[PDB]
Symmetry: D2
Subunit: 461 residues, 4 copies
């Protein structure tokens, strides 16, 4: 008799449980945290609010938190990212979950509220795990009193980390935060290699288009852009890369990509004459990876080659001007999360019109929207950092401090490199890799300890 949840179909739990059991065999660092911390229950008494894509991998993270003594209430941070069998398996385990694939904006905010409100009253939560900063924002603005009982926040992705650093700069951050994103076992694993695996995966599932030999334009060459570009180049695409950062643009050149701008001389003045129409007219696929706003604007969408694929893999859908296409062009749904955007007009469309674009996931996270996001063995590194971060702040008990000590402890920090290396060692062991041990003469030679850390904090890997 348990009802504190809402999912798409609860009869999918058995299917979800089967994939969770498989996923656990793929997540040795996360499962390793279960064995190491089960006896001590480091999260005994923790009441975590979690907002992150309700996938099979999140389910293993959720149950790792529960198995260490934490009670949780969960929702997804994107309307399309939920795997309905995962949410059913979590709901069947008696865990409050409110998520399903294909939510509306109303139901998205409603699901976040159900994590905040237990029986119409704010839940006595003391921890926050967020992915993107949506939950962090609603708490800071609509329920400020609840932050006086919270010991910290653990933010997953780059976008949310920036929103936190804006509050630490404006002094509006109430509880300290752990930058989970900037762990190397997260940033240079999740963001890069994760998109390398799931970008072409999502494009194949959505369109079944051959990618080899076609022209692609990747907007951005950060960690997501590096992996996305590799995701396409290893399929045989001719990949071009756009950047505003000259350093990231230099890496693209050395990595074998031609660096181009959508605008003549790189100057985006908002006009049609600025668009490199010749370049945009040969592009078969464009992927936005910036986390910025309107990096695939209307004039770019108007100049795109007919029947080009448009998708976003940054956190928010405002990287593409989907609002422009909703206002001016008619959408023909091919299937869930696949739409043909007929550039002929808004008042209907010809079914055999050749001048259309193909938008995936309505501009949302395409890897989670049109597929299943990152594989379990990669999310293993991300969520092992998340579990360690939840402990690293719960054991510090920020909320129990006087105001004078709170000011000196308030910050946004990454985990120490020692934790980062420990997660990495468990991931390497999952591949059967054998790490070499330094001899005492060698550790002295390079001035490190045999047990690490092996790099100064300034090292970039």
């Amino acid at each position: 008799g348990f009802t504190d949840y809402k999912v798409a179909d609860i009869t999918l739990a058995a299917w979800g449980r089967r994939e969770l059991i498989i996923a656990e065999s793929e997540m040795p660092a996360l499962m390793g945290l279960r064995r190491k911390y089960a006896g001590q229950q480091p999260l005994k008494g923790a009441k975590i609010l979690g907002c992150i894509h309700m996938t099979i991998q999140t389910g293993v993270l959720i149950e790792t938190l529960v198995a260490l003594g934490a009670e949780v209430r969960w929702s997804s941070c994107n309307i399309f990212s939920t795997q309905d069998q995962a949410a059913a398996a979590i709901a069947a385990a008696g865990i409050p979950v409110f998520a399903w694939k294909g939510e509306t904006e109303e139901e998205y905010e409603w699901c976040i509220e159900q994590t905040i409100l237990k029986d119409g009253q704010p839940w006595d939560a003391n921890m926050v795990l967020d992915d993107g900063g949506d939950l962090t924002e609603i708490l800071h603005k609509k329920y400020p009193q609840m932050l006086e009982r919270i010991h910290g926040i653990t933010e997953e992705t780059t976008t949310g980390v920036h929103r936190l650093l804006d509050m630490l700069k404006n002094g509006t951050l109430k509880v300290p935060a752990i930058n989970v994103n900037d762990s190397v076992t997260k940033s240079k694993n999740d963001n890069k290699y994760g998109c390398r695996h799931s970008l072409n995966d999502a494009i194949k599932r959505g369109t079944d288009h051959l990618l080899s030999g076609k022209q692609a334009l990747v907007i951005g060459y950060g960690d997501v852009g590096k992996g996305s570009s590799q995701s396409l180049r290893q399929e045989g695409m001719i990949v071009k890369v756009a950047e505003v950062d000259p350093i990231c643009a230099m890496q693209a050149c050395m990595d074998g990509f031609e660096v181009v701008s959508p605008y003549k001389n790189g100057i985006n003045d908002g006009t049609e004459a600025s668009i490199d129409a010749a370049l945009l007219g040969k592009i078969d696929l464009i992927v936005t990876t910036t986390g910025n706003v309107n990096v695939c604007d209307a004039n770019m969408l108007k100049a795109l080659k007919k029947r080009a694929v448009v998708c976003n893999i940054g956190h928010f859908d405002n990287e593409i001007d989907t609002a422009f296409m909703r206002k001016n062009w008619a959408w023909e749904e091919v299937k869930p999360q696949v739409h043909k955007i007929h550039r002929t007009g808004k008042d209907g469309f010809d079914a055999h019109n050749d001048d259309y674009l193909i938008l995936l996931a309505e501009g949302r996270l395409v890897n989670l929207g049109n597929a299943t996001g990152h594989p379990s063995r990669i999310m293993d590194g991300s969520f092992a950092n998340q579990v360690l971060a939840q402990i690293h702040l719960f054991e510090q008990k920020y909320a129990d401090l006087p105001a004078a000590e709170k000011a000196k402890r308030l910050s946004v920090e990454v985990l120490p490199k020692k934790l980062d290396e420990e997660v990495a060692l468990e991931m390497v062991k999952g591949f059967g890799g054998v790490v070499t041990q330094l001899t005492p003469k060698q550790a002295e030679y390079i001035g490190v300890s045999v047990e690490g850390p092996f790099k100064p904090d300034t090292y970039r890997y």
Copy 2:
């Protein structure tokens, strides 16, 4: 002609060197852009720079850029096998004191650094230092400590040199401030990685002409140099295995598609032949050390390596391979300069048709510079543009002329500001013909940066 203050292999190679210098200038836009931006201002007027770095064509473009900005220099190479003799000849013929040639002995190498330090038998009036590896910095602190009183800074090129500087700084033995040129993103993530990608397989082909496709390679280390070294072999079709002590770098090697193995059973190096994974090493056609550590290809590993395997090092010092063991116990047969067959059948002579031998490249020294020409000009353009900026900043700071209290507040090891790193990168990108997009004012505010940059926090790892 009147100028005899140098020593190179063959001065008649100068015209050849000049032709390749003119070519390299077209390949180094960031460095030539600095040469044109600061030519009129002469920011290095009065600078007298002691330079110790591989006397290649690329170094020559760095030298003449420093001189073009007003500096005087005295130069030597930081490795016995790395000098390009036509590069050294063009520099000497340009009226520039240079003491470097390919194939120096260990005594001549020390002698060449001494010749830059001393002019006419007395200490030169140097006020700046450019170093690659820290050998020159070490000789100054030990044998000529009085010279450091007039020196305003050191600009260190490579990772091993920066480590030696940081140890001296912690021990309070560093007498002058330094700039970590290596840790610029347009250096570490350009020179150290992409440079070795270009030049590792290049050196092995020139030395052995061995087909690399389909053969088994073991790369010791997966730092910046190990990353590019593994890519250099993997892009040629080698089956590449990676060894590492850092699990994070090991994690990257797995995700990059490499099998991570250790030369020792369970990774434990206890010094016994029994600890050696003889099965693994008996399958290896080529081993490359990239660590900057000591004895990472030890004696027992050399005994266990497959017959006719190739052994080389692309780290800064030759002690990564126990070449001393091989000199002591095995016979060396010179195939050609910097290529030695090492016969494991004994020390006295060898059968000319002996099958049990190893091929050692560059006698364990930097193989890319020893058996080829090191990094290409367009890559070195980023490194040496950071060097010029680093020389200008430390020379204009004038540490030796500061008060004591100000000396203590600036006695440190620093990196260049990210803005200068981005400006070097921008000229590199333009050299490829790339076009960088300019942020709109609203986009710049959306991500919290200036339209001009910098675009990343100092914590960003790229």
Copy 3:
């Protein structure tokens, strides 16, 4: 109005299938160019084609091209798992007899084929055959030989089906001539290789969502399918080892940067469990069979596989893997359709948390079509353009109307002319926006070819 001569999973999927068919048409320029060139001529007017090939969206475009050229068809799939139900629905709603759905039983599979052969309980007046694998060909020669008396030819799609055709030709049991569509270059060196490159990792990701980078794969076979399959995994960052019985194909795997190994010690398959290289197979995370041969992943290999390894087959028939052994001894746990966990702990039941299992995809059937959608439209464009040209050629030849003495002079297995192979390629290249250069008259005379081609001798291997 009242069309019931079909059997599909769900007719309401027709609108969805039509939308994807319209998309696929824009991805298949060679096939749509054939439909535009030959529509007015109706070269297949009077052709009655028995079709047996994976009822995919791509096959739908092929079907409607044959019908647009004037043919009548009756269709089934050549595999129990390869049908796309939305494609079968769209074809059925168009008034075209089709009998195919995803997840047929063996009996339902045979029934579907017979529904194309029979119309209203009697043999259809068929005169052409399009086949993929040779099942429909085999049923006609064995069960309906009188129908072949009126059939002009067979256009066979795949390597396995072509081998079965040549077995009949040497034995004198082939009743009608055939065109080997497989050995067009725009089919063999496009469909078989690049198609598997695209769809092999696609199917594994959809079935398991397993990370592939850094894990060990074993590909059995290095033909066209094995070449593309190895690349499908190596481009994802797998450490890929290759097995082969052909030394030439093994040489290519070596040169392509793969380690060539055998599942058996010294490659000797004696049938005993002792011949298995248990150490090798205990390291393998994924095994893929690509051979078209029998039992290339046998019971002993399956017993020695690493725990939780994935087992799949991309050859035409499931007997490449000894799945019968696994049915007899081990318990099958369905994760989801076409994905099974096979627990090696026993037959009667299993622990839900058992760790000693294998993951079998598509029950050993064609994994790219079983767990994904097979090859993409733009690749199948080349294969199915050859099919249309082959059908047009054999139908126009009218073999069945010859006298018995003239039939025997024409009974053969042939390939399409190279000029047609080249013309299919040109349209494929134009689909990518590529621009083929035209020879000058002097250049064409220099290499001894016509300006319009063919540009290669028939012996050229590309």
Copy 4:
């Protein structure tokens, strides 16, 4: 006092011998044949005229032929391809060889004539080994009486095969020939993987240019063009491919390359107007791989981006219109086989001029001209076929047969597939590869013998 040779420096023999001993360890197929047929001496009485790149790898081929009973007289088939230390070691072994690196055209012909003539009179040769057809050409048209005693020709390369087939089609071929090129262990190994190894190798030694991130244009996508394209693409070059064969162009597209033409709409009308000046104005490196004439013409050379590198890896230098450049532009030698072509005029040049092109090896085969050509382990496959071909033709004894039996055997043939497979097996074993043996049931299942041949002659691999 053996003086029947002409090399650059006989003192380089010991160096050449040290490298010959190494190459033997890299060539198991060729060295296996040397050991297999040593006892029979199947080439006893064979007097072989040999014309092929006097490299270290050719040294092992020569010494294998003499070890089977053959006398030889040798020359190189290119003025820049000889390794001087290989020629010295061969001459020091008492083998007549006339070759050095950097011959003039007049010295080239003199070297071939020195093999043809012994003591002023034609040698009593009976076998011909040729690479490119120059020696076959000189024999047919200047020494036709010598062909009356020659049993056959074994031709190495694609260009030479074409010349043999033209002579056969026109009735001018006087002796039978074996097409060594079209063995799979030759064409699909030497022509493809050999250029993959040696193309970027020669460009690095000649210019030391960074290749990653620059634009390359490869003319042709045959066996040499495929291997050349990968040689550059694996270095990080943005490679564009040109082709007249749409089947090869299709392969380039699927292999991930953009297929373009130097001429607008691929139409070469001879005028500057037909040149895609915008495309050629962005190319940093152009490589010709066709075996055709004038595929990099004067109009293309005028339009190339400043400081672009021009090189040819086809057999003959006429793939590039170097004659136009000698007539109109000033040549500045950087170093042997590396020239800057100053497009500012014929009479003189400014040493600091920026409008030049870099020509490698004066248009001759760049991999052999600026480096050492294919590696030993690759040439192992080609030269094993050559030895088998010399044995087969010498034993046929065409020069002894009657007229009607000559007309039956006057042909150009390839080696049997069974031998092609046996060569590949030794090559595979050289890598430590293990080939699986078919079971009797499996061999019956696919209709082959356990010993092979495993493919029909129609198979393309």
